[PDB]
Amino acid sequence: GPSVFLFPPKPKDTLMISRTPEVTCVVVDVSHEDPEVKFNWYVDGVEVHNAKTKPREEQYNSTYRVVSVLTVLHQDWLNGKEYKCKVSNKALPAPIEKTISKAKGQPREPQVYTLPPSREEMTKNQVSLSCAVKGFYPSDIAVEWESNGQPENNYKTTPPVLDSDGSFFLVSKLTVDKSRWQQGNVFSCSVMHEALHNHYTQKSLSLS
Amino acid sequence: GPSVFLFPPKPKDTLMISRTPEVTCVVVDVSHEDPEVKFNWYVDGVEVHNAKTKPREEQYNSTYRVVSVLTVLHQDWLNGKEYKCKVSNKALPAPIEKTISKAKGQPREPQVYTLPPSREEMTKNQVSLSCAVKGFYPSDIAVEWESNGQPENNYKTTPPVLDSDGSFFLVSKLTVDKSRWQQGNVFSCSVMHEALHNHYTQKSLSLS
């Protein structure tokens, strides 16, 4: 039957005032027979009416998918307000309710460490640069890579893992051509987190 | 003082027998004064001696960083064996111990849904394709994007989020040039997870 996703804001959006964080409610597998979906949004148990529901999309299998987006104020997110998406449809026994809210607890500052290619790895058409981060709380964090003003997008960042002290750790690995590593190009790992000064730090790395 | 990372295997490595999963113990901020670091590895409380410790690396600030890697057998990982890295150094009050193990619980199968660009988003030099996954357990999962045999690396995958039924959900967003979306190129979201048939499923998407 009908299935619901409720996605939190992007970390980067909550951290920069110039950006617009938003919560996204996605309904899938709604039947052709009764295609009408009603969204009700709530912030801390109280209904709100400023969400923007998108037009339904018929799937190749006859089902519909529908997205509803609610903007979140920066102060509201930080104040730990609970955002709720309730989804109603005739083909449901009861409405489906999803909730998301900012994690509770004292923020803790990420420690960022970069690691260059190993010697044994330093012998191929491609090398990996690591950006290891630990000690952060909450687990909401944005990690990006760049070189010479141009974003580097060929990187994978592990999900934050809960550490033994209640903080989180991760690593982001950038894969570049061994040649570019040799030209002496500087590569920068930028990290954004609420507990950082200015919500921002950058660590850079190059050969030698 | 000395700080330790203990990283789990890559999901993809644990899922394919032809691959070699490994656990990585990374020690940072070890002092110039006493640079000697000893690793002891344990699998379920019993010491093992087949780890491969890399040569120490002097940092620009005089500290050292050292990595030790332990291969993990596929059967051992699935059997829930606890991997422990103990790290000893003269500048430590007590040795530091980190542990990782496969999450306990019944595996649950990911449901994968792709979402094309919105109409309002369908008006820029760049569009985003979404691959939404939910209902999976454990949270270890590999999600990749590809088009015409060539990997698509300009995508970001949200960390798995714990759902209300104890399973996890995420979304992976691929950003491509609006033009390529128009040429009618097919884009494929591949997902690997233990609960999938053959540890693999693929969902494809294109214009029209």
Question: How many angstroms separate the first and last alpha carbons of chain A?
Answer: 58
- How long, in residues, is chain B? 208
* Cβ–Cβ below 8 Å for A161 and B8: yes
Q: List CB contacts (< 8 A) between B159 and chain A.
A: 139, 159-160
Could you say which of A8, A154, A169 has the minimum Cβ distance to residue B5?
A169
Task: Transcribe B38-71 into DSSP letters.
Answer: EEEEEETTEEE---EEPPPEE-TTS-EEEEEEEE
CA distance B154 to chain A (A): 5
CA distance A154 to chain B (A): 5
| Residues B207, B125: Cα–Cα separation, whole Å | 16
Domain boundary among A43, A74, A101: A101
Q: Are B129 and B117 in contact (CB under 8 A)?
A: yes
Domain boundary among B101, B127, B151: B101
Q: Are residues B62 and B129 in the same domain?
A: no
Q: Are residues A89 and A43 in the same domain?
A: yes
A178's CB contacts (< 8 A; 6+ apart) are A117, A122, A124, A125, A126, A127
Which residue does chain A place closest to B101, by CA atoms?
A: A161
Q: Are residues B157 and B110 in the same domain?
A: yes
Q: Which of residues 57-76 of A touch B (CB under 8 A)?
A: 65, 67
- Please, what's the b/e burial string for A148-162 (b: 16 or more CB within 10 A of its CB; e: otherwise)? eeeebeebbbbbbbe
* Cβ–Cβ below 8 Å for B65 and A171: no
Q: List CB contacts (< 8 A) between B52 and chain A.
A: none
Q: Are residues B81 and B124 in the same domain?
A: no
CA distance A102 to chain B (A): 12
For residue A109, the domain's CATH number is: 2.60.40.10
Containing structural domain, residue A132: 102-207
Q: Are residues B53 and B82 in the same domain?
A: yes
Does the beta carbon of A117 lie under 8 angstroms from any beta carbon of chain B?
no
Can you say whether residue A139 is alpha, beta or left, with left for phi > 0 and alpha for psi between -120 and 50 degrees?
alpha
B46's CB contacts (< 8 A; 6+ apart) are none
**Closest residue by Cα to residue B126 from B75, B62, B173, B71:** B173
Q: Are residues A10 and A86 in the same domain?
A: yes
Does the beta carbon of B171 lie under 8 angstroms from any beta carbon of chain A?
yes
Q: Are residues A121 and A203 in the same domain?
A: yes
Q: CA gyration radius for chain A?
A: 21
Could you say which of A26, A132, A164 has the minimum Cβ distance to residue B132?
A26
Does the beta carbon of B82 lie under 8 angstroms from any beta carbon of chain A?
no
Q: List CB contacts (< 8 A) between B54 and chain A.
A: 118
| Residues B154, A139: Cα–Cα separation, whole Å | 23
Measure the CA dihedral B33/B38/B39/B42, to 10°: -140
Q: Are residues A106 and A203 in the same domain?
A: yes
Total domain count for chain A? 2
Q: Are residues A119 and A186 in the same domain?
A: yes
* Cβ–Cβ below 8 Å for B3 and A171: no
Q: Are residues A52 and A93 in the same domain?
A: yes
Q: Are residues A55 and A127 in the same domain?
A: no
- Determination technique for this PDB entry? X-ray
H or E segment at A94? none
Q: Are residues B136 and B176 in the same domain?
A: yes
* Cβ–Cβ below 8 Å for B28 and A164: no
| Residues B208, B102: Cα–Cα separation, whole Å | 42
Domain boundary among A45, A71, A101: A101
Which residue does chain B place closest to A9, by CA atoms?
A: B158
Q: Are B134 and B169 in contact (CB under 8 A)?
A: yes
| Residues A8, A17: Cα–Cα separation, whole Å | 17
* Cβ–Cβ below 8 Å for A164 and B98: yes
B67's CB contacts (< 8 A; 6+ apart) are A115, A118, B24, B25, B26, B27, B53, B54
Does the beta carbon of B158 lie under 8 angstroms from any beta carbon of chain A?
yes
| Residues A118, B168: Cα–Cα separation, whole Å | 34
Q: List CB contacts (< 8 A) between B171 and chain A.
A: 5, 7
Q: List CB contacts (< 8 A) between A169 and chain B.
A: 5
| Residues A192, A20: Cα–Cα separation, whole Å | 16
Q: What is the CA angle A25-A28-A32, rounded to 5?
A: 130
How is chain A split among helix, strand and coil, in percent rounded to 5? 10, 50, 45
Backbone angles phi, psi at B178, to 5 degrees: -50, -35
B91's CB contacts (< 8 A; 6+ apart) are B1, B2, B30, B31, B33, B34
Q: List CB contacts (< 8 A) between A171 and chain B.
A: 5, 7
Which residue does chain B place closest to A112, by CA atoms?
A: B28
